Design a protein around this ligand. Structure first.
Ligand code: 95B
Ligand code: FE
Ligand code: NI
Ligand code: NI
Ligand code: NI
Ligand code: NI
Ligand code: NI
Length: 278
């Protein structure tokens, strides 16, 4: 029951309800988890906390997000590989082995992107009704949080910590959902969209004086060693209202950084934003 998927990187012909599925996007992984779809292989080295069960010996280990074990993947001979942004460079290597579908998020159209990705999984796996109900559920979350947000304002800055350094994200970025979808006003509308964020001094933060400081601890999930609290909470940042009002919201990097774009991760992300602004 073959179908053809158009995607950012080409057109892939895929068997419906494939037996062996290898997944390199944790958003997809958590989506397939949510829909009760069994996967064969995952990159166990970078599995998020909330997806720890895919460490089990019943799943094949296909390496790291940034370090696919191509030989192992070959030995599995999957019916479908699903990849996203971190593997885009390696699309052709995956595609040589087995039908590969790229599922990225368009940060200019986050929800549309996400919904199309989830509906593609709906088609592939015969989970259209299930996908639809989850999308409608998320829509009701977006709805309620927008309404909270649109009550009294103050502006937010989104930051990421790694190796003592701090970088920023605004609208239309990797974390743009906060501004773009959930109606939280940006402290700076014009932050340059890059993968690991626009580098910034602590003087920029104090200067912008956000009411909310959203923080993503990258080192927690990349190096296994949290450092965000220790980086962020310095002289210049304690000037901030976000500090003085205890509105430094540490976003769970297991969801936000390693994952995202999945039925579980997007609902958790929205819930964390809601808590943060309550
Ligand atoms: O293309 C990507 N990364 C290329 C540069 C990797 C640099 C390298 N990064 C990591 O070790 C890393 C490990 C696991 C997950 C990650 O997102 C990482 O960036 C470093 O810290 O020197 C990428 C794409 C989408 C989202 C990301 O977080 C990416 O890192
Ligand atoms: Fe990264
Ligand atoms: Ni190996
Ligand atoms: Ni081998
Ligand atoms: Ni509907
Ligand atoms: Ni640049
Ligand atoms: Ni106070």
């Amino acid at each position: 029951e073959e179908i053809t998927i158009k995607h950012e990187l080409g057109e892939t012909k895929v068997k419906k309800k494939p037996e062996k599925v290898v997944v390199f996007d944790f958003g997809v992984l958590d989506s397939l988890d949510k829909l009760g779809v069994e996967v064969t292989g995952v990159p166990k080295a970078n599995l998020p906390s909330y997806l720890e069960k895919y460490k089990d010996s019943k799943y094949e280990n296909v390496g790291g997000l940034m370090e696919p074990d191509f030989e192992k993947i070959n030995e599995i001979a999957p019916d479908l590989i699903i990849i996203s942004g971190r593997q885009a460079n390696s699309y052709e290597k995956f595609a040589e082995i087995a039908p590969t579908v790229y599922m990225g998020i368009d940060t200019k159209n986050y929800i549309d992107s996400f919904a199309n990705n989830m509906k593609t999984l709906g088609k592939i796996f015969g989970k259209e009704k299930e996908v639809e109900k989850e999308l409608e559920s998320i829509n009701k979350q977006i709805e309620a949080v927008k309404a909270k947000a649109e009550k009294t304002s103050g502006k937010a800055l989104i930051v990421l910590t790694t190796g003592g350094k701090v970088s920023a994200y605004g609208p239309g970025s990797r974390f743009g959902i906060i501004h773009d979808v959930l109606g939280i006003k940006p402290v700076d509308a014009n932050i340059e969209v890059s993968t690991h964020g626009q580098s910034i001094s602590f003087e920029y933060i104090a200067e912008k004086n956000p009411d909310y400081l959203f923080v993503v601890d990258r080192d927690a999930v990349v190096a296994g060693k949290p450092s965000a609290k220790q980086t962020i909470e310095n002289e210049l940042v304690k000037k901030t209202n976000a500090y003085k009002n205890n509105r430094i919201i540490y976003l769970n990097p297991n969801y936000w950084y390693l994952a995202g774009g999945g039925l579980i991760s997007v609902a958790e992300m929205i819930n964390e934003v809601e808590k943060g602004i309550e």
